[PDB]
């Protein structure tokens, strides 16, 4: 049951596999937002979403805006982020980025992640844009 | 062929396991250093490490100063990374901590990934003590 607006992501290998299952939200509004549900290798035992989770989550969440505006490959230059409150095992996780600003093709994304009404990290991303790549279904230049 | 000083990391479930192997430095000299090997499941799917695994390593090698020096349980409060450089398939990968200071059970500690002469990431990380748990082998406590 994958809350609406949301489908599953899918990778053969490498680390989104690795802290899978991830969801993308489809085409149109809240389309910028991706999430997950907490399982236990999310977890740090203890029924509680690692904060190392919370991060990488956190990385491709906010960077997800370079890809949809741009498909372009990017790469994480600085990333900055406040840890407010925790997630647990079941919860369903989401996270979203406003892009500020460009520089010469530095990104900076302004960021949350939340479970519900609770914010769990607010902080800061800035991605460095690389080059042209294949695009991907819902993104402008597809 | 682990490199001198280094023992793997052994967990049976939850984060560190799915972004395992990691490695932890034996006691004395350099113990603060955990280490991993950059294998598939932690790149791009394009023989580099994914920015969002190098800053879950940095999480867990920065905040094991807290670890070693009190046994206690911890919480990352906040996490800033500067991304200077990128680690490849098969690069074997460090990072350490230096605590600068306490408030009120918050540890400030300042930090790097290098991958050889390679400096990968430096920042600075924030952790909150929460409460005496199991000391572990090599920690002051054990």
Redesign the interface.
């Known amino acids: 049951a994958i809350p609406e607006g949301f489908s599953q992501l899918n ?1 053969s ?7 899978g299952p991830l969801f993308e939200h489809r085409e149109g509004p809240g389309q910028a937002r991706l999430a997950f549900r907490v399982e ?6 203890l029924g509680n979403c ?4 919370l ?3 956190a ?2 969440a906010w960077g997800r805006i370079i890809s949809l505006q741009k498909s372009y490959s990017w ?9 407010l409150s ?1 997630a647990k095992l079941g919860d369903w996780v989401e996270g979203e980025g406003e892009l500020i600003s460009e520089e010469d093709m530095l990104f900076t994304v302004r960021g949350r992640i939340w479970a519900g009404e609770r914010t769990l990290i607010t902080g800061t991303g800035v991605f460095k844009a690389l080059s042209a790549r294949k695009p991907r279904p819902g993104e402008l230049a597809y």
């Open positions: 990778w290998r490498g680390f989104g596999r690795q802290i236990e290798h999310h977890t740090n035992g690692h904060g190392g989770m991060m990488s989550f990385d491709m790469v994480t230059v600085r990333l900055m982020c406040d840890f925790g």
